[PDB]
Amino acid sequence: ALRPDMGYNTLANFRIEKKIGRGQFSEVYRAACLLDGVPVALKKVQIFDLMDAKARADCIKEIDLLKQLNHPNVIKYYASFIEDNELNIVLELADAGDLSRMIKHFKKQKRLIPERTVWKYFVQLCSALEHMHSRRVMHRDIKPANVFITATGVVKLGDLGLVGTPYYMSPERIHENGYNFKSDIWSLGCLLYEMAALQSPFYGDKMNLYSLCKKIEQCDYPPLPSDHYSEELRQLVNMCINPDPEKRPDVTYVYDVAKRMHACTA
């Protein structure tokens, strides 16, 4: 059926086109609204038995804070509702593709990324991450697969969240301390590395869940080429993955560095 009285607040007002979202943790489909006609993507959480009352209310607690966020580099959250005992969220469409796939493109090509373009996208990201840190919200999970670039080139970021593993593990997310802001930029620091090396900084020789942690605790990661990447960057990455969080910068300083270095490369 169809009900315009509840615009964006029911799957009855959406024609799902493709399951453009991979994985079994959640299914994200690209759809088209049957009213205004704008294409939108919906995200379904199978939280019927995946979450418990104390958690269900905790998750609905976060999407509302996230709703209060208007930035051209953060994805627009249009509506939230629950039908079929599953959580539904409809946000802006990023059809062009993710940065994770954008890395793989070059990785298969065997042609590394120029220092000129990584700033072209990175600054945009920090702009967002600061806008979120301005509202005292943290992305929680910054990975190349959640940073979406449009066909035009604008940069927008995705959502947040048998041993489950975040892509970039914080040195404080190991000793089980709280996920603070200065850990949200740890993930961001490792992100800059992945664009210049096209693979995580701690991606292990013989993947080992434990040595990876000491490698994170000791900060023993493979340096980058002295020839192709500005030393401001190779020192900006090493500055953002300092184990002790106090010794790390704040988002806005990384924003400052990203901006000025973005103009020197043009």
Residue numbers in the entry: 21 to 181, 196 to 300
Please give sentences taken from the publication describing this entry.
The NIMA-related kinases (Neks) are a family of Ser/Thr protein kinases, first discovered in Aspergillus nidulans that are conserved in eukaryotes. Nek7 is 1 of 11 Neks found in humans, and contributes to the assembly of a robust mitotic spindle apparatus. Human Nek7 is a 34.5 kDa protein, comprising a singular canonical kinase domain made up of a small, 5 β-stranded, N-terminal lobe linked to a larger, mostly α-helical C-terminal lobe. The intervening cleft between the two lobes forms the ATP-binding pocket and active site in which phosphoryl transfer takes place.
We, therefore, obtained crystals of Nek7WT apo and Nek7WT.51 in the same form as the Nek7SRS. All three structures have four chains in the asymmetric unit, and in each case, chain D has a poorly ordered N-lobe. The analysis, therefore, focussed on chains A–C. In contrast, the side chain of Y97 adopted the ‘up’ position in chain A of the Nek7WT.51 structure, and was poorly resolved in chain A of the monoclinic Nek7WT structure and was not modelled. These conformational differences might be explained by crystal packing interactions: chains B and C of the monoclinic structures form a symmetric, back-to-back, head-to-tail dimer that covers the surface proximal to Y97, whereas this region of chain A is exposed to solvent. A comparison of the apo-Nek7WT and Nek7WT.51 structures indicates that the presence of compound 51 does not alter the conformation of the R-spine. While the monoclinic structures of Nek7WT have two distinct conformations of Y97, all three chains that were fully modelled in the monoclinic structure of Nek7SRS.51 have the same conformation of Y97. The position of L180 in Nek7WT is also more variable than that of F180 in Nek7SRS, but the mutant still fails to achieve a fully stacked R-spine as indicated by the position and variability in the side chain of F180. Building on these observations, we generated a mutant of Nek7 with an all-aromatic R-spine that formed a partially stacked configuration in the co-crystal structure with compound 51, in contrast with the disrupted and variable R-spine configurations observed in the structure of Nek7WT crystallised in the same crystal form.
